[PDB]
Amino acid sequence: QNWCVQPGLLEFGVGCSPLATLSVTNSFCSRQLIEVTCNVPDLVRISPSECYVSPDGGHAEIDVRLLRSPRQDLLEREPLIVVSMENERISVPISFKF
């Protein structure tokens, strides 16, 4: 409603940059701290993982750098980037192309 994350999917692997970038837009009336995390440890390097975003449509750009491939076979969770802002969370799935 008051904020959003683009794109809606992060693509790594064959044909892709080793680097993906997220854009987080804050349309609340006040400046907001965000935290950007991954639901699988030691899978990506997120930079910066915390920053402030200006209100009224300000935005921050966040690098996501894949460190290893996910192991669905080793029953890791389906990998997600999670952005947290105010009391809310938006998840962005990660795909690795073979």
Could you tell me the CATH number of the domain that includes residue 55?
Answer: 2.60.40.10
CA distance 40 to 70: 9
Place of tokens 């409603």: 1
**Resolution for this experimental structure (Å):** 1.9
Residue 38: domain span: 3-86
Alpha helices in 1-98 (DSSP H): none
Method underlying the structure: X-ray
Dump strand ranges (E) for 10-79: 10-13, 19-26, 32-38, 44-47, 50-53, 58-66
Give me the residues paired with residue 62 across strands.
Answer: 22
Size of the chain, expressed as the number of residues it contains: 98
3-class secondary structure, 58: strand
DSSP conformation class of 89:
E
Number of domains composing the chain: 1
